[PDB]
Design an enzyme around this catalytic site. Structure first.
Site, PDB file in Angstrom:
ATOM      1  N   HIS A  40      -3.742  -1.820  17.522  1.00  0.00           N
ATOM      2  CA  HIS A  40      -2.389  -2.172  17.960  1.00  0.00           C
ATOM      3  C   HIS A  40      -1.293  -1.413  17.200  1.00  0.00           C
ATOM      4  O   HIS A  40      -0.148  -1.477  17.581  1.00  0.00           O
ATOM      5  CB  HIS A  40      -2.160  -3.688  17.997  1.00  0.00           C
ATOM      6  CG  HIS A  40      -1.820  -4.324  16.685  1.00  0.00           C
ATOM      7  ND1 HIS A  40      -2.742  -4.952  15.855  1.00  0.00           N
ATOM      8  CD2 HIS A  40      -0.609  -4.471  16.069  1.00  0.00           C
ATOM      9  CE1 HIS A  40      -2.107  -5.442  14.792  1.00  0.00           C
ATOM     10  NE2 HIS A  40      -0.823  -5.149  14.884  1.00  0.00           N
ATOM     11  N   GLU A  52       1.447   5.069  -2.446  1.00  0.00           N
ATOM     12  CA  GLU A  52       2.729   4.409  -2.397  1.00  0.00           C
ATOM     13  C   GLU A  52       2.751   3.128  -3.168  1.00  0.00           C
ATOM     14  O   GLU A  52       1.796   2.349  -3.132  1.00  0.00           O
ATOM     15  CB  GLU A  52       3.105   4.067  -0.961  1.00  0.00           C
ATOM     16  CG  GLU A  52       3.522   5.280  -0.136  1.00  0.00           C
ATOM     17  CD  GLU A  52       4.939   5.733  -0.428  1.00  0.00           C
ATOM     18  OE1 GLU A  52       5.479   5.377  -1.516  1.00  0.00           O
ATOM     19  OE2 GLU A  52       5.536   6.412   0.408  1.00  0.00           O
ATOM     20  N   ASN A  54       6.685   1.626  -4.087  1.00  0.00           N
ATOM     21  CA  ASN A  54       7.987   1.427  -3.397  1.00  0.00           C
ATOM     22  C   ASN A  54       8.044   2.448  -2.238  1.00  0.00           C
ATOM     23  O   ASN A  54       8.093   3.666  -2.492  1.00  0.00           O
ATOM     24  CB  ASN A  54       9.140   1.612  -4.338  1.00  0.00           C
ATOM     25  CG  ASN A  54      10.434   1.175  -3.715  1.00  0.00           C
ATOM     26  OD1 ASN A  54      10.718   1.498  -2.570  1.00  0.00           O
ATOM     27  ND2 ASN A  54      11.247   0.415  -4.481  1.00  0.00           N
ATOM     28  N   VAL A  57      11.303   4.853  -2.259  1.00  0.00           N
ATOM     29  CA  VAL A  57      11.630   5.640  -3.449  1.00  0.00           C
ATOM     30  C   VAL A  57      10.429   6.553  -3.722  1.00  0.00           C
ATOM     31  O   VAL A  57       9.288   6.073  -3.768  1.00  0.00           O
ATOM     32  CB  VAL A  57      11.892   4.743  -4.674  1.00  0.00           C
ATOM     33  CG1 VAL A  57      12.233   5.589  -5.922  1.00  0.00           C
ATOM     34  CG2 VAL A  57      13.048   3.790  -4.421  1.00  0.00           C
ATOM     35  N   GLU A  62       2.764   9.817  -4.687  1.00  0.00           N
ATOM     36  CA  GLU A  62       2.602   9.877  -3.255  1.00  0.00           C
ATOM     37  C   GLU A  62       1.842  11.125  -2.815  1.00  0.00           C
ATOM     38  O   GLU A  62       2.013  12.225  -3.389  1.00  0.00           O
ATOM     39  CB  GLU A  62       3.951   9.904  -2.558  1.00  0.00           C
ATOM     40  CG  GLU A  62       4.797   8.646  -2.745  1.00  0.00           C
ATOM     41  CD  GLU A  62       5.716   8.641  -3.952  1.00  0.00           C
ATOM     42  OE1 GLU A  62       5.625   9.536  -4.815  1.00  0.00           O
ATOM     43  OE2 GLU A  62       6.506   7.685  -4.005  1.00  0.00           O
ATOM     44  N   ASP A  84      -9.806  -4.576  17.685  1.00  0.00           N
ATOM     45  CA  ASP A  84      -8.513  -4.098  17.171  1.00  0.00           C
ATOM     46  C   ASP A  84      -8.733  -3.216  15.954  1.00  0.00           C
ATOM     47  O   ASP A  84      -8.522  -3.601  14.811  1.00  0.00           O
ATOM     48  CB  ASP A  84      -7.585  -5.262  16.847  1.00  0.00           C
ATOM     49  CG  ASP A  84      -6.182  -4.835  16.559  1.00  0.00           C
ATOM     50  OD1 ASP A  84      -5.852  -3.638  16.856  1.00  0.00           O
ATOM     51  OD2 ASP A  84      -5.378  -5.673  16.050  1.00  0.00           O
ATOM     52  N   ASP A 171      -0.042 -16.036   3.870  1.00  0.00           N
ATOM     53  CA  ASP A 171      -0.639 -15.321   4.997  1.00  0.00           C
ATOM     54  C   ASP A 171      -0.161 -13.875   4.993  1.00  0.00           C
ATOM     55  O   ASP A 171       0.808 -13.543   4.286  1.00  0.00           O
ATOM     56  CB  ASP A 171      -0.136 -15.988   6.305  1.00  0.00           C
ATOM     57  CG  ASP A 171      -0.868 -15.652   7.566  1.00  0.00           C
ATOM     58  OD1 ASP A 171      -1.922 -14.941   7.593  1.00  0.00           O
ATOM     59  OD2 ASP A 171      -0.412 -16.185   8.627  1.00  0.00           O
ATOM     60  N   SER A 172      -0.805 -13.033   5.775  1.00  0.00           N
ATOM     61  CA  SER A 172      -0.207 -11.769   6.159  1.00  0.00           C
ATOM     62  C   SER A 172       0.810 -11.975   7.261  1.00  0.00           C
ATOM     63  O   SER A 172       0.948 -13.079   7.769  1.00  0.00           O
ATOM     64  CB  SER A 172      -1.305 -10.759   6.490  1.00  0.00           C
ATOM     65  OG  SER A 172      -2.124 -11.176   7.551  1.00  0.00           O
ATOM     66  N   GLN A 174       3.968  -9.748  10.090  1.00  0.00           N
ATOM     67  CA  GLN A 174       4.447  -8.534  10.708  1.00  0.00           C
ATOM     68  C   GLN A 174       4.704  -7.446   9.679  1.00  0.00           C
ATOM     69  O   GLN A 174       5.314  -7.722   8.659  1.00  0.00           O
ATOM     70  CB  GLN A 174       5.745  -8.849  11.482  1.00  0.00           C
ATOM     71  CG  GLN A 174       5.564  -9.624  12.857  1.00  0.00           C
ATOM     72  CD  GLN A 174       5.104 -11.100  12.846  1.00  0.00           C
ATOM     73  OE1 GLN A 174       5.669 -11.904  12.153  1.00  0.00           O
ATOM     74  NE2 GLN A 174       4.245 -11.464  13.795  1.00  0.00           N
ATOM     75  N   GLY A 175       4.224  -6.252   9.968  1.00  0.00           N
ATOM     76  CA  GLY A 175       4.357  -5.124   9.065  1.00  0.00           C
ATOM     77  C   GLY A 175       3.169  -4.938   8.147  1.00  0.00           C
ATOM     78  O   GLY A 175       2.990  -3.877   7.568  1.00  0.00           O
ATOM     79  N   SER A 177       0.179  -5.438   9.534  1.00  0.00           N
ATOM     80  CA  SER A 177      -0.755  -5.031  10.577  1.00  0.00           C
ATOM     81  C   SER A 177      -1.479  -3.751  10.226  1.00  0.00           C
ATOM     82  O   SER A 177      -0.830  -2.792   9.803  1.00  0.00           O
ATOM     83  CB  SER A 177       0.004  -4.736  11.902  1.00  0.00           C
ATOM     84  OG  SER A 177       0.485  -5.897  12.471  1.00  0.00           O
ATOM     85  N   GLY A 178      -2.794  -3.724  10.424  1.00  0.00           N
ATOM     86  CA  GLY A 178      -3.557  -2.547  10.152  1.00  0.00           C
ATOM     87  C   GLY A 178      -4.087  -2.423   8.748  1.00  0.00           C
ATOM     88  O   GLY A 178      -4.952  -1.588   8.495  1.00  0.00           O
TER      89      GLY A 178
HETATM   90 CA   LIG Z   1       7.231   5.779  -2.872  1.00  0.00          CA
END
Ligand SMILES: [Ca+2]
Length: 223
Positions: A40, A52, A54, A57, A62, A84, A171-172, A174-175, A177-178
């Site tokens: 999804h 990652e 932050n 920033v 990264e 899914d 819980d987990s 929105q955002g 996801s995955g």
């Molecule tokens: Ca960063």
């Protein structure tokens, strides 16, 4: 993640952010070239962001690598969220060291009661909205199949499991996801769906990764 904790920078070294001009989903690095996420979360033009903490920033660890290919599971159904799961190939291999690392695939399915770590940059509120900049974490147990089905009548397939807390508050969301659900050092789940976030009697529902290991391995071997 609602009701979790700040992980700490680079303490979850397999966690990735999928970026299309902005963070939109999590994922899990499973080798130098490949990421597991939710189907999804599919879209074109994905940049995978590894290392990652932050996400707003540049902090020094990264790696930003564009996807070359996305493969949604052949049997994904977006109405039911059955199957899914999606694989994303990186255009170049990630550099692996202790802050950026792959997570092992399961060799066996996990049982209800097992403790897991769920992580992501999703909403931290159960009512209303607040998105964190730094990675959040939640320790939560896998719930029994019977409690999961009772919570979501007619909706839980053999490719799903519930994890979390029936009392609500953790819980987990929105955002997230995955993103990963890791138990004893193995990727056992993918953040998939739920009714709202952190609601009483409505735990998180996760893709049951152990069912997909054959598909993942064969897909990687030929792509
Ligand atoms: Ca960063």
């Amino acid at each position: 993640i609602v009701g979790g904790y700040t992980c700490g920078a680079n303490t979850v070294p397999y966690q990735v952010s999928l970026n299309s001009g902005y963070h939109f989903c999590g994922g899990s690095l499973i080798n130098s070239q490949w990421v597991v996420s939710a189907a999804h979360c599919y879209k074109s033009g994905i940049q995978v962001r590894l290392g990652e903490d932050n996400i707003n920033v540049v902090e020094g660890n990264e790696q930003f690598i564009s996807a070359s290919k996305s493969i949604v599971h052949p049997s994904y159904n977006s109405n039911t969220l059955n199957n899914d799961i999606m694989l994303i190939k990186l255009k170049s291999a990630a550099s692996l060291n202790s802050r950026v690392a792959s997570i092992s695939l399961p060799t066996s399915c996990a049982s209800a009661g097992t403790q897991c770590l769920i992580s992501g940059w999703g909403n931290t509120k159960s009512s209303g909205t607040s998105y964190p900049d730094v990675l959040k974490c939640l320790k939560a147990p896998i719930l029994s199949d019977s409690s999961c089905k009772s919570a979501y009548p007619g909706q839980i397939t053999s490719n799903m499991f519930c994890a979390g807390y029936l009392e609500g508050g953790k819980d987990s969301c929105q955002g997230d996801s995955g993103g990963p659900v890791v138990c004893s050092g193995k990727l056992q789940g993918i953040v998939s769906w739920g009714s709202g976030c952190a609601q009483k009697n409505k735990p998180g529902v996760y893709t049951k990764v152990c069912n997909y290991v054959s598909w993942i391995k064969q897909t990687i071997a030929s792509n």
